[PDB]
Amino acid sequence: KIPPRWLNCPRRGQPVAGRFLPLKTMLGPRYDSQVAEENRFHPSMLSNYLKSLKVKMGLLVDLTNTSRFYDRNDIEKEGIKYIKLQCKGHGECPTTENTETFIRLCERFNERNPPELIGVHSTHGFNRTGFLICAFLVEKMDWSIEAAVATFAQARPPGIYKGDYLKELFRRYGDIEEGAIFLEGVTVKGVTQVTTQPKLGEVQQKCHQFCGWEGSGFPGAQPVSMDKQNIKLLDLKPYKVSWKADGTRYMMLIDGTNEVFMIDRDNSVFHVSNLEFPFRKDLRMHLSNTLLDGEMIIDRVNGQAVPRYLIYDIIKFNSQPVGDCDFNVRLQCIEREIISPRHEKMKTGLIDKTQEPFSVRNKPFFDICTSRKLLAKEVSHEMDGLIFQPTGKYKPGRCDDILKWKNSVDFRLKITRMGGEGLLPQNVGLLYVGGYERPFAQIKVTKELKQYDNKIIECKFENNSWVFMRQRTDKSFPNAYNTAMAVCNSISNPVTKEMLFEFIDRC
Amino acid sequence: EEDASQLIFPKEFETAETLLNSEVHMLLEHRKQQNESAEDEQELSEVFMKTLNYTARFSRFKNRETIASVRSLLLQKKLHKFELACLANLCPETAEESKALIPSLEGRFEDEELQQILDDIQTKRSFQ
Amino acid sequence: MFYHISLEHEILLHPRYFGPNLLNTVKQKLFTEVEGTCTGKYGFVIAVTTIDNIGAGVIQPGRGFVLYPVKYKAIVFRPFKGEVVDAVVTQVNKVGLFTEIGPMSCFISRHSIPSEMEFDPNSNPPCYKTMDEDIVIQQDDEIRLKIVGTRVDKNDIFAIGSLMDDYLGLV
RNA sequence: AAAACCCAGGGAACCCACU
Numbered sequence: 007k008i009p010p011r012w013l014n015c016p017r018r019g020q021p022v023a024g025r026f027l028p029l030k031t032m033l034g035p036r037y038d039s040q041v042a043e044e045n046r047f048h049p050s051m052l053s054n055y056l057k058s059l060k061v062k063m064g065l066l067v068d069l070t071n072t073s074r075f076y077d078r079n080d081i082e083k084e085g086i087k088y089i090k091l092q093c094k095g096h097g098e099c100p101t102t103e104n105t106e107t108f109i110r111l112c113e114r115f116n117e118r119n120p121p122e123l124i125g126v127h128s129t130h131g132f133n134r135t136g137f138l139i140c141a142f143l144v145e146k147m148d149w150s151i152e153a154a155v156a157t158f159a160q161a162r163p164p165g166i167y168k169g170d171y172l173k174e175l176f177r178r179y180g181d182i183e184e185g186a187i188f189l190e191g192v193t194v195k196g197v198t199q200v201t202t203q204p205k206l207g208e209v210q211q212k213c214h215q216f217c218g219w220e221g222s223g224f225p226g227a228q229p230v231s232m233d234k235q236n237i238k239l240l241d242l243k244p245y246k247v248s249w250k251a252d253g254t255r256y257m258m259l260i261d262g263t264n265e266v267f268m269i270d271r272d273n274s275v276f277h278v279s280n281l282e283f284p285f286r287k288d289l290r291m292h293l294s295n296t297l298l299d300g301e302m303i304i305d306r307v308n309g310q311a312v313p314r315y316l317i318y319d320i321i322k323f324n325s326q327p328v329g330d331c332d333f334n335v336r337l338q339c340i341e342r343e344i345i346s347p348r349h350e351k352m353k354t355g356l357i358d359k360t361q362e363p364f365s366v367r368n369k370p371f372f373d374i375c376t377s378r379k380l381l382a383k384e385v386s387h388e389m390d391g392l393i394f395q396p397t398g399k400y401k402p403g404r405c406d407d408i409l410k411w412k413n414s415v416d417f418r419l420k421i422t423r424m425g426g427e428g429l430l431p432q433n434v435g436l437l438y439v440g441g442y443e444r445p446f447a448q449i450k451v452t453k454e455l456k457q458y459d460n461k462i463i464e465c466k467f468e469n470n471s472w473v474f475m476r477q478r479t480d481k482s483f484p485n486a487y488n489t490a491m492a493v494c495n496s497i498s499n500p501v502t503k504e505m506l507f508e509f510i511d512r513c
Numbered sequence: 514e515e516d517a518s519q520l521i522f523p524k525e526f527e528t529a530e531t532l533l534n535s536e537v538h539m540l541l542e543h544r545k546q547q548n549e550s551a552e553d554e555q556e557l558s559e560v561f562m563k564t565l566n567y568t569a570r571f572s573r574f575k576n577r578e579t580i581a582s583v584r585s586l587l588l589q590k591k592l593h594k595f596e597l598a599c600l601a602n603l604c605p606e607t608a609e610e611s612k613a614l615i616p617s618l619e620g621r622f623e624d625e626e627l628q629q630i631l632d633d634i635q636t637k638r639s640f641q
Numbered sequence: 642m643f644y645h646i647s648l649e650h651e652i653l654l655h656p657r658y659f660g661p662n663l664l665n666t667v668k669q670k671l672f673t674e675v676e677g678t679c680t681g682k683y684g685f686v687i688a689v690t691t692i693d694n695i696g697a698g699v700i701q702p703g704r705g706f707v708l709y710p711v712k713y714k715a716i717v718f719r720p721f722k723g724e725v726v727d728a729v730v731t732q733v734n735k736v737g738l739f740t741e742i743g744p745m746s747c748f749i750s751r752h753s754i755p756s757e758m759e760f761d762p763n764s765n766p767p768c769y770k771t772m773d774e775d776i777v778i779q780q781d782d783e784i785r786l787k788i789v790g791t792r793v794d795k796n797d798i799f800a801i802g803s804l805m806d807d808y809l810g811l812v
Numbered sequence: 813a814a815a816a817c818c819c820a821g822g823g824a825a826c827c828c829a830c831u
Contacts, residue, residue, distance in 0.1 A: 009813070072814080074813080087795065095813095096813095117794075118794040118795070119794075121739070427653070427655075429655050429657070430666070430669060430670060430673065515721060515722055516721075516722060516723050517721050517724055518723045518724070526644065526646070528646075529644050529646050530646070531642060531643065531644060531645070532643045532644070532645050533643075534643070537643050537716060540688070540690065540716065541688060541716075544688060554669065554672075557672075557676055557677075558678075559677055560676070560677040560686075560687060560744040561676060561677065561687070563743055564685075564687050564688075564718070564743040564744060567729075567741075567743040567744075568643075570729075571727055571783075595642060598643075599642075599724075603725070610808065613807060614725055614808070
């Protein structure tokens, strides 16, 4: 796959003398999943804009010996001539071997696609991409023998460069002598991400201590998606549920009067200012060494989006291991030690609900088989999911007893006339995802589908194939191959409110 | 190696037969019409409609009867297929222009007869 | 020149696509696989006029598909060396002239363009014109060009025109 | 560094067996 610093990162250097592109290489859909978006670099990105950006170069040459960077078929499909070179990496600069033949071949291209330019590309695009450009410019672009050697820097600034290449370049062609978003959609006043390492690491380590978590990252309990096997767990032990609403998982660590922090699935830490958590006995002293688990959800009431935090579990309360107790006891502790003191001081006017950044509440909970009523389903559309908590004590990490219940993949659609050998060439919209360049799905291409070509689109499994749910152009890249595996189970089991409601209802 | 200015052709294009811009236009229009019918058939190639529009823009004989009249008029004179097709396509108006555009017509016909042929072409040119 | 010739090509049929109607499948295959193609010997395969002959189907020994030698009338075009051809101007450049002949792009460089026929980017369309402003060759014009040479690359042919000889330029 | 070890890159001469 891709090593660290697989790419230097500046995606494309400007053309040397407005003639030769000083770029490099790979990061196709297969490597999109393991790469950051600014780092992300598809042939499409250098190209979908290129057709009208006047960046539409007609020759592409791959200098690095390894072919692991990306598939060369797309470049030919783009119409850019895909060429590859065997310039050794590891700090090897060429000496007219695989270079002089290329230079004449490159000269042959000069007119092979003339309105178009050339694309030369070494491992990082500086280790001989310039040396080859410098070599050719001296040969045909009449660039000064010493100056052409330095010309690559003008268009592709070297940054990390290779001295070994410069010495051979100088000698052969002249003289060697020369992100963290708290709540997406609504901004909350007083919530500030903490980037200071002394406090960030301290909060992370204290959360790990309070959770008793082995590894690094999020210490939280991670529920699992159900199959026909997980349903068996009814007859072994009781359960308790609340409704999963579309929100972000957050743990609040109460360490003092102003020591309130947010911890998400990415382990990022934010600081909340104006939240006050009184102690039930003395309302003047504020809670410390308290760890809560909950979700941050946007709730629209009276046409206004009110951020809310629903507390559905407690891990630590004043260093007391409440997480080791029963879940009912933990819910009662949540109630009496969190919700009641805050409302108690709110009634006296010492805590103003308007001045706090967001509301604090506890999620209501139910059970095993009975209260079927919502599956006479009145809120059948308002149900996005449901969260399953057993009666046992809290356990971090992956929990096979804690279940998560919840169209739907971005697709790199490629409409291709797949040409079978000895077969009628057949046009088909190949559907593939990041990490899976191989098309998991191939769909009959309607002319209406043919309006969108090479388009990232959300697809709804209308039939066995997924008709586009939406044009998910907003997702620049298609989702991971594993997300396709995840929906390969998710849209394979019909997962319904009538299926789980009783199951979340009785005991 | 090849030069049609003095009618040097490769051995492959010895039995070849030339066509007009209008003949090619009408053939391509008929093929487009049969493509409109006969469903479960994809669209034709880019070269297809490219040449179709190219020969529709430069069409000079709007009638198939005009095509037949031009052929029945031009075939009985001693002309090569390339020279005949080029004369009927470019449609020159002066014998000097016809001889300059096609340098292989030098002495094939008398300049007065050549001008009479050009006048006939202009007479049967479907004006727009 | 636009030519009407007979060409021989072999079509390969998998048994999966035999079907009840077999010859129509071969006709569709031929109408797809040669159309829009270009050969260095016969030029642009413009269109297939009429499928003339279908040869005997020799099944390849050991391997599954059958082989059909097919003779068919085809409309073709191949650029020549030394002929004046009508063209449509697609772009005027300080280096050359981008012209079009059907599907073929032709590049008329300025050194092969006479000295009077100068380039001016100051005009709203970048165009070629003389100092007398009589002959103005600009975007989307109908001109005539003198084909000097043709180059084939990636299975298609592009050519180079010139205006040295007399009666060359705007119609 | 797709470390897809998707699993040899040695040859020559001699001897010994089995049919």
